[PDB]
Subunit: 307 residues, 5 copies
């Protein structure tokens, strides 16, 4: 029951696909397992590159195919190389870049908690066993990750485990257990751009939306809350150009709905103030003076936004 | 007349192409059919991976090519492997990812009823028969499908059937009947994002559109419904950024037309109220007071769009 | 001079590229020509799939390469298969998907008259001849083509013809005439979405644009036609998000220019009415009353594209 | 020193990448050079297609690799074919589609002067010589180039020349001179769409921008030029949806800056007219009457731009 | 310990991916190392092209695989060619185009300081040594780089160095040192388009935003700063169409936040001026006259934006 020692060098994790729950990993893969001793020219290990590996397999060299369980489709293998040793052992070294899949909760948006994962596991081989797994995270923790979209938590987490497949084959005297390495890498989103060029101006607009109560006339109060209405729509549109398409409402997405609400409340009170009277065109002296009543009736509905 | 036993593991169904009626399916394919007994090294089944399969076919091993009837173009086969048994039987195992086609009615938009389908059928072989078909849908019961775009109904539906091709070959003594597996998987769209950040604010804008009648002057009433007009256009524009391009009008698409309608009605009544009088500038006392007459003359044309 | 019998099964015609005059066709191709009789294992026709075809060609089997003349680049051939008969004849069967080119006039936009074309023609062979051509349009008539973007007219049109190339080779004793099948499929665009969510609201905006004349003041009349101006610009922008990029003006594209015209006419008259007087601030009593004069000077004076 | 006769058939030149200075060319390539006489089955020329060419090269047939100097990356070769003659000569015929590079000045935008270029030149071969070059431009002189994005000038320009590489090899007794065909095809952009749906409405908006001076009040004159300001911004946005991304300012791009200028001039004069006085709130009687002074102070500083 | 002489010809550096920190380089690669003398047909160097190189490697010709360390995935190798000399030496010549990665700070946006990098290094070979490195920057001086997006500083910088890998193999008696060429090319962004069609109009809008103080009424002053508010939002939206998506705030991105600030300040002062009085509707005589107080209280704030 063969022993394989894996080493996976992560080079870059880049381009997260928010809708599809997908990210890209470029790196190298190394596998080493010890075989029947061999006569190597010189007595120095043999190096077999690219084209030439398929040839040694055709001669009878076993090289197991190991699959990225959670990869999308099939990845882009750069330079492969077999290093064959005189005393038997064989080191397989391939550079790769490919798209991976994991569960990805983007709900708490621009303050985001994510984890990138690879899953390696021998494709066709039951009892060959992944010995020990190593992971070399190149790029560094605090560094210049302000140039970078993501900050990694985070040194690489490993986990060799055994996975059982229920629906097995026409072999069953105890043959459904495959050796799976699982590599995790925690990360957090760089909440910069989204705070300053996003949350803040949306706030200023929500804020200035309230200065509709400091207009004198009733006519001025209603008509102004209309260009206010469409200032929100014009903003949502700008949100739709920059923000990543999702199937749930993000933090930002809500703030923007709160905007529509604050101004639709405004419209209701402004119209209420004018036709709740005893004597003619008498605007409700006190209600029109919620000037600084629902700015903190929003910071109050807005501390229950944060349950 | 050969018996083939198929097993199809669905891994992910992702990325629906709304215009092209296309979706992506990642999974494994398994086929098993029993052949002439064979001498296998050891007396344990033989494993043949990737490169090596073509070699056994070149020696004379039959392996049938089975086509995804409804795939688009040709898919991305990851790791293939033949498992050859001593007693004859052969298991073919390949991982795949590829784009599929089905009819797709998106009319009832954000509350959407869809079904994903595979169609497998032997490419060139008349009498070899698909025995029984199995389908392993990877998730379960009460999940986290709120992270996910689609909810599956839905345990996999199967259906082995016989399909006849009218325009056949130069063989015809009863040879036009191919064995076709058909796998269905029902699903529903996660109406979340589209309700909260879409239907609702469109409603609030439709609603507030009506508070044009609570303006005093006639001048105020007409001029306001103009910025109201373009508030709708600025909204439709935001719809065009997020919503999926279609060749029919969706539910949302209609609501937005109703918006244009309500405000064009407004412009008609507002101008009518002013010039339906006697000899002067006497606004029609009662008509201008449809204030809460066609908000429920809208909720009334509104057991129509989805009734 | 060899006789080849072609059969082309169209499966889907999807994804029109409006700028590049390109569409995608997924289907099967069948070619059958009779050769020197052969010893086939059993005495049943031989089936040769994929990998194995190149092997028979290497042994000496002729299989002609036939080119899609009007394809873009080179297509995506799925499953090929040779069926070799004992009495000689050979049937070539390949599934394909690829991008095609034809002239495409999108001028009369959302009411669109288009025709999809394949052109098959033996690549390197002068006297081998395309016998007869068959075309199996799967995709059906009054069906559910409301789910579909295009309606096909339209049963497939054929046409085997001979095409002569002027600039020939160093062979010329009558050798410049190649056998070309040409398959046409007429189609019309589903003018749904574009009428309802496009032509109509553009009309309502053009319409309501005219109610600028029913404002009292001159100040109200000018200032209002300005937000009216940019309502059009905001609309064109929404046009730009949904409509397919072209190098000519479509029907819609014009209607939108008529919008800019109507409102620039408005600006002219409104300013004229105010400074054409037999006095001081006396608005031209009658000119300001073109209220329902150029709404039907628009349904008119610009109504001759049906010339 | 071998004589090669080239023939290049241009089929389509489509999809210009404005940023990257890239265009696509689909066509055929033909090379003919005479070799040592050969025994051809029959005594008719031999035809070798696709798979089979590599086989004759493996036997020792020289076929030179000729490179598109200015191609991007490496192209998509469709059907290749060697035609081998009994008297020696060899005709190489390949269909191709690939992306090419040339210098591309888009400055004078929608009235555009462009030229598409191929550069063919033997990859590894010093003294083999490109004999004479032929170019068959399919697309026509008097046509329907209104369906087409570009109009070709323009019959194909040729030019076989010798090019010297300074930094050569370890061969230098006069060995740095390679034979290069250079094919040019002049073209002009179809200024249609951009005149009618772009330049014109930008003009009307520039025009109507001036009718700000025909407002009575000073309040009306300032406040109106603001919605006028953002009408320009809303237009520039529409520009950004349809126009091709560039690294310089186009003709249109300027016209749009002139728009921002005219209205920022307006804001300056309008505010000047109000506080350049004698008796209090006395608007400068004459300055406010530049009503038709800087519309032709724009047709004046605007015609120095181009000319 | 083998000596390799590298020569890298840069043809084009194009298409920078701002988010992924990626650029494309098209060029040629040359490697020359001297081997055991050889019998070459004639006694002139042998030329081996494309298909044929793999054949000589199969015979036993060593050709080392050299990897672009920093490339993304794996590049597009055009025409390869071995030139084998009688005296042993071998020149390897390949054309390539591929995507590379470097750190890329876009913070100081449209005035941008960037450097493009290649890293070459023998994939599997410890003691073979990169001799000397040459780099032929075709692309030119002061030239016509106004047609071009980038201006190169900048003649090519080289640097052969030794790199040590900590986590090495089962070989360790001093075997972890690989020979790495590193080629740098400095560049600056063409600040044209972004100055004229971007910074400037953003300035005019910021500028004209201040003429809100030269309105008479208080009602006019508040209501106008609202359309002023959404003039900024409409601008940011135009920013989002043209500017490259980033994860930090650029120069421009700030200027635009300053806009939102200036107008939210305005709204604050304008509302302050009105309710900071004795008793009645007496606008604060002096505060309303910050007319030209915070235009230079902005040229004072947007000036510690560099210091």
């Amino acid at each position: 029951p063969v022993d394989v020692s894996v080493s996976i060098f992560i080079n870059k994790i880049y381009g997260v696909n928010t809708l599809e729950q997908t990210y890209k990993v470029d790196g190298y893969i190394v596998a080493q397992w010890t075989g029947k001793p061999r006569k190597t020219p010189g007595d120095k290990p043999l190096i077999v590159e690219n084209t030439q590996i398929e040839r040694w397999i055709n001669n009878g060299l076993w090289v197991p195919a190991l699959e990225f369980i959670n990869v999308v489709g099939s990845p882009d293998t750069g330079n492969k190389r077999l290093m064959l040793f005189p005393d038997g052992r064989v080191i397989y070294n391939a550079r790769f870049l490919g798209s991976f899949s994991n569960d990805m909760d983007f709900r708490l948006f621009p303050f985001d908690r994510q984890q990138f994962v690879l899953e390696l596991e021998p494709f066709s081989y039951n009892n060959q066993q992944l010995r020990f797994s190593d992971i070399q995270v190149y790029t560094e923790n605090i560094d210049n990750e302000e140039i970078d979209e993501w900050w990694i938590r985070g040194k690489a987490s490993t986990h060799i485990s055994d996975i059982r497949y229920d629906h097995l084959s026409s072999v069953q005297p105890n043959q459904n257990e495959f050796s799976r390495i699982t590599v995790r890498i925690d990360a957090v989103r760089n909440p910069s751009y989204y705070l300053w060029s996003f949350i803040l101006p949306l706030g200023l607009i929500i804020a200035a939306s309230w200065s509709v109560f400091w207009l004198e006339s009733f006519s001025e109060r209603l008509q102004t809350s209309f260009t206010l209405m469409s200032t929100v729509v014009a903003y949502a549109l700008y949100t739709s150009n920059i923000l990543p398409r999702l199937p749930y409402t993000t933090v930002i997405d809500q703030m923007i709905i709160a905007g529509y609400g604050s101004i639709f409340a405004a419209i209701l009170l402004i119209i209420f103030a004018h036709h709740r009277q005893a004597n003619g065109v008498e605007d409700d002296l006190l209600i029109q003076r919620c000037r600084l009543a629902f700015p903190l009736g929003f910071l109050a509905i807005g501390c229950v936004l944060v349950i």
